[PDB]
């Protein structure tokens, strides 16, 4: 079974929700990302797995472990469920040495006193804090203090290790070099993991599989692949992206085009299949196409006048060295396009644009869930 | 009503106890320290009134919430809380301004915009961050970003504001500027505040009163003129003071003197009626005078031969500039004075030292409490 779950997860204050009937198993052994915009309800999600914030209502569980249940007057205390809060401030005893700090868990269970020695100094020498042992918390640097607390963490192997944004204080190298340092020592430890950040790249690069949440709402929980590729809705396809993904309304016509208005596309024959056995045909719903998608036709792989061409006219070119974003206009419609360095755009000059048709998604327009 | 209360809380781990049968009551709006040398359950005890750890036994209220009470199955975890836990660097939201980063507290409280505004602007012209308003996070140094943290803790205006001796990571005069202004804001937002420190100078200096705590006891709670004048046993009178209170056996004689053995000194009258009373007149008790009540009789006030005068001879004279710390010592027993910088004492050579009576301590000889 599950390495955590929650089950119909709210938190409200008065009228405010944030966190609206959560249900999320997170596998064993598994790193999870909770992504989502600020105030989306990931850090409050974290908060109760943790139990530092109790659930308004529903159940959480920590292995077999029901550890909060309010309807139940369930809740157990966050020092009493077998989690790791990488989080420094409340996971050290500034007054006690880094030694102590490192040695506590273990103490604690009565690990005989020559085996906490070897573990701790095991840990301490894998972080470099070998020569910080006789220092107290109080007096190191918060990077020292970081890496003290995820020795605590590790010394002993918790069912879940929980973090939030623990790179936000990080120089765009160090990031870079501790994103694939910090997961290559997941694996190597197999505990189950639920970070928290709003960082995309961060999500992507690190996580096994990714909640979305917006709102305080669970959007989709997928690899990197699935919520990038296969958007669960608007929101996701959304807000993972760089330009963001372009929306355009369209009305399913019944000779299997998606009509803009301003221009028509055509769909391909399977996606045609799929709306017209939902009932869309006829229907408007929602287009949307990545710009890394469009393509400037002099260099497309397949040009297809009235199926996957339009004429647009650039309005911007920006020149990024590698490639250019070129913001495209169809009359009262617009959209950009990631173009190959080798497109000869020019700001006000007219270009044909191929559109990547079996990287489309289409949406409904009142719900924003994906058919495709 | 306090603002925070302890009713005979305890914490204990097994055999070992960090926090004993401790009731504090913190006033409302007052700045309290709790101090105590390492492993005196200084931290244990701000981390119960957080609610990162649950007591043993007693209750905890915030305002006129009961918190936590194990008896009745209650516990409140942290975030549920009125309180604001002040640390490291908190959860700086990117790609958002700082005058957005302290509001969102307030967006969510749906708090009308004129009064968000304002509120927003007198906390930053607080924190010296008004200049920095329309500024993202990445555009700031570390202490700004800091300060951008506090400001939206106290825009949500907590019951009381918790922190473990923050300023330990700084350099010696940043630390003596930093007390005033931390002093200075808390009294500017006039909540109560609970800080933990255990640096003996800092406690007088910031606290309007300090809970003394000496291996998971409270020992006293008092002003600082209260704990360094009025030390209420043994531990707070040697715990604070440079150089330490001096300690000699006596036995209060049945003719008003303390006897010392190696000499006497006549106690004030209203000194020997309390002894008398409590029935201490012919006991030994432990007695106690600190070093800047002993004088060079060369340049005493007032000089009375056999009442409180003594010869010594000089063993160290350390020359401090402003002053000198004399080492001395009458047969068997030694005590320390510090005298004025005009002292001509000299190692080897005796001095007569006048002894400040209305300034000495009685303390029980088996309990240390102090009668006086
Ligand atoms: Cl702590
Ligand atoms: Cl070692
Ligand atoms: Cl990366
Ligand atoms: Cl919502
Ligand atoms: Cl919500
Ligand atoms: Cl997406
Ligand atoms: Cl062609
Ligand atoms: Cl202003
Ligand atoms: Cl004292
Ligand atoms: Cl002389
Ligand atoms: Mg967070
Ligand atoms: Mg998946
Ligand atoms: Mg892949
Ligand atoms: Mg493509
Ligand atoms: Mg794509
Ligand atoms: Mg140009
Ligand atoms: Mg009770
Ligand atoms: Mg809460
Ligand atoms: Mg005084
Ligand atoms: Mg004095
Ligand atoms: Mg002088
Ligand atoms: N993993
Ligand atoms: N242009
Ligand atoms: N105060
Ligand atoms: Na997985
Ligand atoms: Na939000
Ligand atoms: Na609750
Ligand atoms: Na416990
Ligand atoms: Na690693
Ligand atoms: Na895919
Ligand atoms: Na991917
Ligand atoms: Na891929
Ligand atoms: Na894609
Ligand atoms: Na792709
Ligand atoms: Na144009
Ligand atoms: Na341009
Ligand atoms: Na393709
Ligand atoms: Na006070
Ligand atoms: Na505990
Ligand atoms: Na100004
Ligand atoms: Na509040
Ligand atoms: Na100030
Ligand atoms: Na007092
Ligand atoms: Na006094
Ligand atoms: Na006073
Ligand atoms: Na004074
Ligand atoms: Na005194
Ligand atoms: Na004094
Ligand atoms: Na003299
Ligand atoms: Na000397
Ligand atoms: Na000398
Ligand atoms: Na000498």
């Known amino acids: 079974m599950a390495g955590v779950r929650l089950v119909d997860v709210w938190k409200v204050f008065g009228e405010v929700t944030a966190v609206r009937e959560m249900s ?13 915009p600020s105030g989306c309800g990931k850090t409050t999600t974290l908060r109760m797995i943790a139990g530092l914030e109790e659930p308004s209502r529903g159940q959480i569980y920590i292995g077999d472990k029901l550890v909060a249940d309010p309807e139940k007057g369930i809740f157990v205390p966050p020092k009493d469920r077998d989690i790791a809060m990488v989080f420094q401030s409340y996971a050290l005893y500034p007054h006690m040495t880094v030694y102590d700090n490192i040695a506590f868990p273990l103490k604690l269970r009565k690990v005989p006193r020559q085996e906490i020695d070897q573990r701790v100094r095991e840990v ?24 003290v607390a995820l020795g605590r963490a590790i010394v002993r192997k918790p069912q879940v290790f929980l973090m939030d944004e623990p790179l936000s204080n990080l120089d765009a190298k160090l990031r870079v070099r501790m994103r694939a340092e910090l997961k290559k020592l997941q694996r190597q430890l197999g505990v189950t993991t639920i970070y928290v950040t709003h960082d995309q790249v961060e999500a992507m690069t690190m ?4 909640a979305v949440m917006n709102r305080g709402v669970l959007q989709q929980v997928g690899s990197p692949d699935e919520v990038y590729d296969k958007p669960a809705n608007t929101f996701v396809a959304g807000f993972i992206g760089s330009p963001p993904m372009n929306f355009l309304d369209a009305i399913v016509t019944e000779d299997g085009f998606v009509d803009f208005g301003e221009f028509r596309l055509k769909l391909l024959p399977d996606q045609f299949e799929v709306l017209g056995e939902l009932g869309y045909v006829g229907r408007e719903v929602i287009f949307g196409i990545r710009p890394e998608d469009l393509y400037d036709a002099m260099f ?16 911007i070119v920006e020149n990024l060295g590698s490639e250019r974003i070129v913001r495209l206009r169809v009359g009262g419609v617009t959209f ?32 924003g869930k994906a058919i495709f």
């Open 24 to 36: 999320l198993e997170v596998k064993d052994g598994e790193f999870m990302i909770l992504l989502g």
């Open 124 to 147: 301490a020498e894998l972080l470099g804090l070998t020569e910080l042992l006789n220092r107290k918390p109080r007096e190191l640097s918060g990077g020292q203090r970081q890496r």
């Open 336 to 367: 950009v396009g990631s173009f190959r360095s080798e497109s000869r755009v020019r700001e006000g000059v007219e270009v044909d644009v191929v559109f990547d048709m079996k990287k489309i998604h289409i949406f409904d327009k009142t719900t």
């Open 207 to 210: 996580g096994d599989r990714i």
């Open 300 to 315: 497309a792989q397949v040009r297809v006048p009235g199926e996957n061409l339009v004429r647009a006219v650039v309005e």
